[PDB]
Design a protein around this ligand. Structure first.
Ligand SMILES: N#Cc1cc(Cl)cc(Oc2c(Br)ccc(Cc3n[nH]c4nnccc34)c2F)c1
Lengths: 551, 402
């Protein structure tokens, strides 16, 4: 059928005329196949023969023992208006409410069962050429949504929405998920009440030009859908096999990481860090990469996690979501969401770096934010968090940090490793502590550098660096002062950059230097750090600047 | 009442902005509201042949309210509402004893929108777990939050306020977006009596972090403040020289020569050090300068205002407004969680900016983008939304503003 639903009015882009692309002469077999395909479509209303006046054209091709007609709408697609996006996202199984009964209906010949705007049809002209293009071709235009045309997915979707609208109003507690050509229908009715409700949906649909499978042809649970398996009271990902290989190519590791990432939605504790490090990053597709011992270790832990099947549960909207997070080594976080303790709706991981330098409190906060968003998307509400950080540690951090930082309702859970701050900077100068005035200067052309200090105890020192930056020497200067220092020390720098880094209490860095500084800061008992304006002739700063600039 | 033709520039296309995820209770609030508006003819369902989108939110009392974020449409339509139909901003409003803000956005819903412009007002109510495609609508009438609405309605607003202005020639009334700003020098009881009077006028045409009234004649600069100390350590003078070095960039006449002389060469930070007569004069003459506004900085109407905010701890926030960096037009401060406090400060600073300049600043916000974007509508009460971006506060600038 072709739906009686009214059409969507459709334009070309403001300054553009329709396509006039020249039909290449075609093999005899292809011409014959097309004539046969088009004759049958013509008799169903899909296409219509058109006059000679129509100036537009789009190339047709035929490929194979059935022949298929391919229309190349590349040019028309460039010329047709933009449409609104089909979807903001895709359903997640963890967001599904368990139903007593659920049916899958796929619409048959979806696009060809929906009419095209009459004012737009002319732009869809194509020509079956005559043998050796000696005589005028047979000319057609579409009356329905063509396959491969930019507007077809959106216009179809909105046709189904309109059509479904009345049926939803009369049956407000039947769940209908729309996804491409598919309709997924769920109720809490007894088998027979549902079967009957489905029949009147099917009939309502058939009245609007849309055919659907019979009860004899309908799929049975479990549904294999979009890489998931959807059972009556659980869901999981479709089976994952991790290849065993002597030699791993770049291609093989990428596919592995993709699979692991997919599995991470329900299998807890999946890790991918050491395998991703192998992919940085110059290497050919079929080039073999030897597995480091760390990648090997990580692969083996993943295999244990995947050895036995794990399932997820469905959503019950009359209970809170609870989200728990664990630190799984450095940079890596893992989480689980459940409503009843340890029946997970879903699982996931977070293992990112916002910035070159960070700490665990900042990473945990970021992980909470990611999870919070994900939850709003899947369930329309925020979970309650259970976090491996003491309330006191968190209070101490957020009250003193310069960013606004907030996390919604949470409780401490003693699941080590616990998140903590590994050092703390003094709020005041330390009495009876040596003050180091530090400085760094690097020549812009030679990229040579000098890092040093002068102190109130009379000490002095300067070291020499090669291919540094001014940034690097200011850090190098601070590391010197920490190295040559007692357990208590005051440090005066004129680098805002270094002060910024250290004040945020990093415990992790992309920088080797910064990680060396962090080692030292942890060992110290007290550190006070102060900043002064450079070149303003401030005692101490003036002096280190001297020995440091010499070069 | 027939429509004013609206235009974009020849070569700007309408907004195509993503809808942020919404919670179930707000989604439900929005479909109650939008079901009503459609019944009333204010909006209509649209089809996929409209490629535009503007984000929508639900805000608050206990009454839910629709807030459409027309920030992109406003930018893309600035020639219309600013140069073609601009509402002149009065310089006297900031001089008044009391300014009251009244919501008048209900006025627009009675005035039909140019049918060729309607498509650019498209918005989407999203669905939980992407169950349904979710509900697309466009406006048939002047929408709230679009700056073209007051622009178009000012002719009718002028009729409405005409007797009241005539009868009260020393009260200033300014329309910014969906609100009227009403200033007088009257005593506060008489002021509130005149507000009630104005409400009655508006009522005959179908109508209606801050406090009850604003009090802008009492608005001040937060002076960069130098401590007075019993005793000065080296650290202390360093901190002082830092503050003064940075203030010397803003204020003509700042000096530090004398104070730097104190810091000889490689002392302990804790070491107390005597305060000289020249150092003390310089210090005292700096204080006088910092009491006054910045000499040389003026509002340029052809430039964007920017606002910077620092988290100062203990529920305290500081802020600066300027057009050229660190050339402050205004500075101030605001005082249960960080995001809530921050949103309150943004709304306070925006309101001040509307009253003083007739425009909003672009904010530099010391917060993670995703956190702000998750949480802000949870506390937002205004009917406009300023432009913002997300920033790391330099740790020193916080120090210099207290
Ligand atoms: N294929 C498929 C498919 C995909 C989706 Cl996203 C949903 C779907 O239908 C369901 C609906 Br509608 C609503 C709930 C569930 C989960 C479920 N509840 N009871 C079931 N019995 N059998 C299978 C799945 C379910 C569904 F699978 C089927």
């Amino acid at each position: 059928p072709i739906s009686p639903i009214e059409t969507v009015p459709v334009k070309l882009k403001p300054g553009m005329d329709g396509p006039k692309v020249k039909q290449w002469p075609l093999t005899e077999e292809k011409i014959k196949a097309l004539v046969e395909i088009c004759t049958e479509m013509e008799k169903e209303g899909k296409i219509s023969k058109i006059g000679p006046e129509n100036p537009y054209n789009t190339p047709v091709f035929a490929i194979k023992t059935k022949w298929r007609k391919l229309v190349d709408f590349r040019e028309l697609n460039k010329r047709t208006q933009d449409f609104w996006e089909v979807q903001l996202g895709i359903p997640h199984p963890a967001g599904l409410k368990k139903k007593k009964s659920v049916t899958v209906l796929d619409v048959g010949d979806a696009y060809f069962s929906v009419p095209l705007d009459e004012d737009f049809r002319k732009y869809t002209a194509f020509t079956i050429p005559s043998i050796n293009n000696e005589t005028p071709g047979i000319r057609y235009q579409y009356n329905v949504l063509p396959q491969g045309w930019k507007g077809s997915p959106a216009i179809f979707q909105s046709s189904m929405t309109k059509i479904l609208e009345p049926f939803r109003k009369q049956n407000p507690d039947i769940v209908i998920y729309q996804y491409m050509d598919d309709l997924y229908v769920g109720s809490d009715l007894e088998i027979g009440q549902h079967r009957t409700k489905i029949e009147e949906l099917r009939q309502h649909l058939l009245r609007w030009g849309l055919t659907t499978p019979d009860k004899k042809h309908q799929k049975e649970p479990p549904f294999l859908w979009m890489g998931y398996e959807l059972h009556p009271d659980k869901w999981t990902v479709q089976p994952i096999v991790l290849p065993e290989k002597d030699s791993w190519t770049v291609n093989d590791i990428q596919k592995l990481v993709g699979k692991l990432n997919w599995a991470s939605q329900i299998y807890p504790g999946i890790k991918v860090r050491q395998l991703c490090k192998l992919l940085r990053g110059t290497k050919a597709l079929t080039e073999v990469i030897p597995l480091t011992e760390e990648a090997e270790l990580e692969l083996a832990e993943n295999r244990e996690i995947l050895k036995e099947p794990v399932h997820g549960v469905y959503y019950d909207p009359s209970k809170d979501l609870i989200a728990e997070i664990q630190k799984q080594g450095q940079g890596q976080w893992t989480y689980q969401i459940y409503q009843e303790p340890f029946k997970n709706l879903k699982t996931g991981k977070y293992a990112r770096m916002r910035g070159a330098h960070t700490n665990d409190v900042k990473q945990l906060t970021e992980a909470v934010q990611k999870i919070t968003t994900e939850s709003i998307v899947i369930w329309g509400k925020t979970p309650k968090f259970k976090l491996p950080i003491q309330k006191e540690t968190w209070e101490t951090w957020w009250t003193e940090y310069w960013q606004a930082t907030w996390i919604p309702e949470w409780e401490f859970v003693n699941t080590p490793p616990l998140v903590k701050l590994w050092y703390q900077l003094e709020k005041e100068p330390i009495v009876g502590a040596e003050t180091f005035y530090v400085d760094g200067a690097a020549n812009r052309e030679t990229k040579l550098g000098k890092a040093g200090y002068v102190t109130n105890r009379g000490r002095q020192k300067v070291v020499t660096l090669t291919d540094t930056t001014n940034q690097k020497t200011e850090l190098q200067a601070i590391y010197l002062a920490l190295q040559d220092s007692g357990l208590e020390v005051n440090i005066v720098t004129d680098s805002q950059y270094a002060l910024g880094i250290i004040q945020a209490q990093p415990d992790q860095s992309e920088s080797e230097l910064v990680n060396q500084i962090i080692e030292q800061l942890i060992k110290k008992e007290k550190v006070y750090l102060a900043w002064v304006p450079a070149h303003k002739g401030i005692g101490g700063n003036e002096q280190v600047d001297k020995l440091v600039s010499a070069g | 009442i027939e429509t004013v033709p609206v235009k974009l520039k020849p070569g700007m296309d309408g907004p195509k902005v993503k809808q942020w995820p919404l919670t179930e209770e707000k989604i439900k609030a929005l479909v109650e509201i939008c079901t009503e508006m459609e019944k009333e003819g204010k909006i209509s369902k649209i089809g996929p042949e409209n490629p535009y989108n503007t984000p929508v939110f639900a805000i608050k009392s206990t009454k839910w309210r629709k807030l459409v974020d027309f920030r992109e449409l406003n930018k893309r339509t600035q020639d219309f509402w600013e140069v073609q139909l601009g509402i002149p901003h009065p310089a006297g409003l900031k001089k008044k004893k009391s300014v009251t803000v009244l919501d008048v956005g209900d006025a627009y819903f009675s005035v039909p929108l140019d049918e060729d412009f309607r498509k650019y007002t498209a918005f989407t109510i999203p669905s939980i777990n992407n169950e349904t495609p979710g509900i697309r609508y466009q406006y048939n009438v002047l929408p709230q939050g679009w700056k073209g609405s007051p622009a178009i309605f000012q002719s009718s607003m002028t009729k409405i306020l005409e007797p009241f202005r005539k009868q009260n020639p020393d009260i200033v009334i300014y329309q910014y977006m969906d609100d009227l700003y009403v200033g007088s020098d009257l005593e506060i009881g008489q002021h509130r009596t005149k507000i009630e009077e104005l409400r009655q006028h508006l009522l005959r045409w179908g109508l209606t972090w801050m406090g009850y009234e604003l009090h802008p004649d009492k608005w001040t600069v937060q002076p960069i403040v130098l401590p007075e100390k019993d005793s000065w350590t080296v650290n202390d003078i360093q901190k002082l020289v830092g503050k003064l070095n940075w203030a010397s960039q803003i204020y003509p006449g700042i000096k530090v020569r004398q104070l730097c002389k104190l810091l000889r060469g490689t002392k302990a930070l804790t070491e107390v050090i005597p305060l000289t007569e020249e150092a003390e004069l310089e210090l005292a003459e700096n204080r006088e300068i910092l009491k006054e506004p910045v000499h040389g900085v003026y509002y340029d109407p052809s430039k964007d205002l920017i606002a910077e905010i620092q988290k100062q701890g203990q529920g305290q926030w500081t802020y600066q407004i300027y057009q050229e960096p660190f050339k402050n037009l205004k500075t101030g401060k605001y005082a249960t969680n960080d995001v809530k406090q921050l949103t309150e400060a943004v709304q306070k600073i925006t309101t001040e900016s509307i009253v003083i300049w007739g425009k909003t600043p672009k904010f530099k916000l010391p917060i993670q983008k995703e956190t702000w974007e998750t949480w802000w509508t949870e506390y937002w009460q205004a009917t406009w939304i300023p432009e913002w971006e997300f920033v790391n506060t330099p740790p020193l600038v916080k120090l210099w503003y207290q």
